[PDB]
Amino acid sequence: ASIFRCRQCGQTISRRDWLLPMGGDHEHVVFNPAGMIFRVWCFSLAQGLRLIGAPSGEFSWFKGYDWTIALCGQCGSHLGWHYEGGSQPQTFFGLIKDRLAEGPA
Numbered sequence: 001a002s003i004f005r006c007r008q009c010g011q012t013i014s015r016r017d018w019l020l021p022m023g024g025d026h027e028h029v030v031f032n033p034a035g036m037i038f039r040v041w042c043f044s045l046a047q048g049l050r051l052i053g054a055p056s057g058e059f060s061w062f063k064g065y066d067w068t069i070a071l072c073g074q075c076g077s078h079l080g081w082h083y084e085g086g087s088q089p090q091t092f093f094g095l096i097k098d099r100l101a102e103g104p105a
């Protein structure tokens with residue numbers, strides 16, 4: 001199955017095999033308080049990121065979870081968020097679909 005790389009630089013990030021259907025669907029379309037819309041795809045696992053700062057519960061799109069911004073560890077592109085502090089699963093990643101490129105493994 002296909003893998004996901006950072007659109008800006010090609011860093012390996014995740015895999016289609018690691019999609020996670022949260023609340024029944026791997027895709028959630030959401031807005032932040034600055035009104036930016038995101039098509040977030042949920043993955044159980046990702047790599048090649050760099051998580052910035054400390055976790056926050058504020059404005060979390062997923063109930064019970066705290067988030068941290070996740071950048072591409074290579075180019076710094078904002079690729080999504082890491083979620084933790086929750087239940088079933090405790091942790092996962094929400095990645096912005098249009099910031100990733102999908103392709104062969």
Ligand SMILES: [Zn+2]
Nearest residue numbers: 006009072075
């Ligand atoms: Zn990148």
